Amino acid sequence: LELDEQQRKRLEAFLTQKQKVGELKDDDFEKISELGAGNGGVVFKVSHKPSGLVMARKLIHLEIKPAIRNQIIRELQVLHECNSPYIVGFYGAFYSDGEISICMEHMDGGSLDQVLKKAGRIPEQILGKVSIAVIKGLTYLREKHKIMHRDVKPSNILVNSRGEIKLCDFGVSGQLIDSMANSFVGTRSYMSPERLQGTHYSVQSDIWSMGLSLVEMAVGRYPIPPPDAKELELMPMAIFELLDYIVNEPPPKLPSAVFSLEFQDFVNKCLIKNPAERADLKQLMVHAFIKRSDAEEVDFAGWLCSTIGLN
Amino acid sequence: VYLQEWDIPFEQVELGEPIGQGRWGRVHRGRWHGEVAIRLLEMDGHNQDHLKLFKKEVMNYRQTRHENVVLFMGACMNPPHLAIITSFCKGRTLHSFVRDPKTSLDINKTRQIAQEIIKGMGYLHAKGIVHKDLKSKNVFYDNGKVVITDFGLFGISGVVENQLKLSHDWLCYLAPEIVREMTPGKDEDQLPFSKAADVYAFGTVWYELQARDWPLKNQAAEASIWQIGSGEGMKRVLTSVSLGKEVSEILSACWAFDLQERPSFSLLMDMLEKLP
Ligand SMILES: Nc1ncnc2c1ncn2[C@@H]1O[C@H](COP(=O)(O)OP(=O)(O)NP(=O)(O)O)[C@@H](O)[C@H]1O
Ligand SMILES: Nc1ncnc2c1ncn2[C@@H]1O[C@H](COP(=O)(O)OP(=O)(O)NP(=O)(O)O)[C@@H](O)[C@H]1O
Numbered sequence A: 001l002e003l004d005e006q007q008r009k010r011l012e013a014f015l016t017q018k019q020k021v022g023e024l025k026d027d028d029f030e031k032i033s034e035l036g037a038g039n040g041g042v043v044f045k046v047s048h049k050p051s052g053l054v055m056a057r058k059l060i061h062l063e064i065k066p067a068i069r070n071q072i073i074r075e076l077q078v079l080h081e082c083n084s085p086y087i088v089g090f091y092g093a094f095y096s097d098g099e100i101s102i103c104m105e106h107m108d109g110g111s112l113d114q115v116l117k118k119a120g121r122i123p124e125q126i127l128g129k130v131s132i133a134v135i136k137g138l139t140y141l142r143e144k145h146k147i148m149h150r151d152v153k154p155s156n157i158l159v160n161s162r163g164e165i166k167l168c169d170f171g172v173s174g175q176l177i178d179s180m181a182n183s184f185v186g187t188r189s190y191m192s193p194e195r196l197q198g199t200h201y202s203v204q205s206d207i208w209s210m211g212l213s214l215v216e217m218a219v220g221r222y223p224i225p226p227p228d229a230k231e232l233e234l235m236p237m238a239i240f241e242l243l244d245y246i247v248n249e250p251p252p253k254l255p256s257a258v259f260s261l262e263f264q265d266f267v268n269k270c271l272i273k274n275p276a277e278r279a280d281l282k283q284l285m286v287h288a289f290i291k292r293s294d295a296e297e298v299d300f301a302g303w304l305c306s307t308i309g310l311n
Numbered sequence B: 001v002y003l004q005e006w007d008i009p010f011e012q013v014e015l016g017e018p019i020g021q022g023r024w025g026r027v028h029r030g031r032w033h034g035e036v037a038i039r040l041l042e043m044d045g046h047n048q049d050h051l052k053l054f055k056k057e058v059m060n061y062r063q064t065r066h067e068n069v070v071l072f073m074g075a076c077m078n079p080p081h082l083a084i085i086t087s088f089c090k091g092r093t094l095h096s097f098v099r100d101p102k103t104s105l106d107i108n109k110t111r112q113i114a115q116e117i118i119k120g121m122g123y124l125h126a127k128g129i130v131h132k133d134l135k136s137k138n139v140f141y142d143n144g145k146v147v148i149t150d151f152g153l154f155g156i157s158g159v160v161e162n163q164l165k166l167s168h169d170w171l172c173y174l175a176p177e178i179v180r181e182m183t184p185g186k187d188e189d190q191l192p193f194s195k196a197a198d199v200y201a202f203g204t205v206w207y208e209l210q211a212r213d214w215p216l217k218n219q220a221a222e223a224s225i226w227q228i229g230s231g232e233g234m235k236r237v238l239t240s241v242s243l244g245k246e247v248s249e250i251l252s253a254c255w256a257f258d259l260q261e262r263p264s265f266s267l268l269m270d271m272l273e274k275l276p
């Protein structure tokens, strides 16, 4: 638990507006604009008509035998129990036209990948807070429902003008992972080196993903292969050589001139290739960098809206 | 090809119910009186280079006939719409056949089925046609007889972003040469299929004849790509649960990391002979 009350009074506020919306179905909704699409399905800003609320709808398109389709929806409904200040507000999941839709909180500022592209780089002061948020979300998930995320990267980190950080698209359902999610491979890879060789992995793999994501946001560039010497002061490869790099070469590290030991050491511990020696979540929670940033005073909402232009 | 250019006498052909979709058009059941499989394709490409290759390959398939290879019958092209018509295979796919409880495979039945598949592939190779898509789901088993389908078909350039989506069943049959080249924005037609890649795919179907399952359990495709193209995954499966020495020897030969060390299909016939 260890749930602040500010947080508990905005969780209750959203579960009880949640029962006001009741159930739903497709034509209750109406489009707004293109949030984006990838590795499965398009997500769009939507307004719900029965209950004056703006949501974000994730549609993914799966013609398969209906038996596993209903198994997927019933496994996905467990999102109703998953409610934390660090996990996006979930409302409902339903099948329609053979297109599964997940309705969730709309997050004003989008994904830290989007944030990053406009921001160019993300300062350390603030990456401290997002790091705390991620370990909290991951611990909440591992302790309360006993799952792991399996896909941590900036495009799955969501921010709002109210100043919260929450995680979207974690692997709650096994059937949906095995039946669709596994088959996609992008242009980048955030998978741990022990997942890539197909051994048993744990939430440790998520620790690795988080470390790689923090490097990308800290230096503005996807970190492998490491930037070359001319590119570093200023600040064309196929997918297999990327994966072979991740497995057979040293991991990224933050530049030593710019960030504190505490940050450098935090990421160095997240990025150890052997998951046994990689820090777990208990250990990361009490790390120097965490104790620092947790006790610091940063106004997130202000930085966010002056970064992207909201109010 | 206007379908009357084929040695099969044709009066009329009727579409029946569909029986599965895929990357290359939609496959219907149909009546030539005989049952047939009709694959409907459409040619985005239009640059008459694609249709030139299509015409070459369809007349190359005309010259084929063999009791272990599905009979190619016709192809017509009213561009962009094209159709490929083969004989319909009664019975079950070998994929779903090894996975049946009631099915009784044994050290004999497996060798026999394998020798059937090898004869078919050997013919196709003799006439210089590369399958480019051998897998358990493209082999049909009806009582005694074993028939290979859907061959040569990856060479064409019809309708299929800058991501990838790769089924797991397919990747298990892919040799390391290929999966190393996979990367978003590269089409399937640019991949390095070959006779050696075909015998590697035969390696996977033989493993499936032994173990009635994939050699790699379902997992994220990036994981499969590394494990396949590094050769590591195939080294570890040969370690993990073994079968018999003579059985496993053919498997280690077909999966050989260096493609040039892979046996020919003629040689594989002999290897399957000197077994229990
Ligand atoms: N709940 C949400 N609120 C606001 N924007 C979102 C939300 N979920 C996703 N997005 C954005 O919508 C776009 C596409 O989302 P998505 O379909 O999850 O693919 P992705 O986030 O880009 N990468 P992936 O998670 O691997 O599919 C991205 O720009 C996301 O930042
Ligand atoms: N000659 C045939 N006789 C019987 N069934 C066939 C024949 N040719 C194809 N099929 C089946 O028709 C369906 C269409 O196959 P196909 O479109 O190739 O899908 P797929 O092999 O499972 N995946 P993909 O190769 O990417 O399309 C499959 O169920 C085949 O097994």
Ligand SMILES: O=C(c1ccc(F)c(F)c1Nc1ccc(I)cc1F)N1CC(O)([C@@H]2CCCCN2)C1
Pocket (backbone or CB within 6 Å): A039, A040, A058, A076, A079, A087, A088, A089, A090, A102, A104, A151, A156, A167, A168, A169, A170, A171, A172, A173, A174, A176, A177, A181, A182, A184
């Ligand atoms: O949408 C998802 C997703 C995957 C697995 C799963 F079990 C889900 F429930 C998923 N959706 C989902 C879950 C919780 C909330 I709160 C909101 C959601 F949209 N994914 C995984 C994803 O991030 C991609 C898919 C595959 C490759 C990389 N990860 C997108």
Ligand SMILES: [Mg+2]
Pocket (backbone or CB within 6 Å): A155, A156, A168, A169
């Ligand atoms: Mg997402």
Ligand SMILES: [Mg+2]
Pocket (backbone or CB within 6 Å): B022, B133, B138, B150
């Ligand atoms: Mg096929």
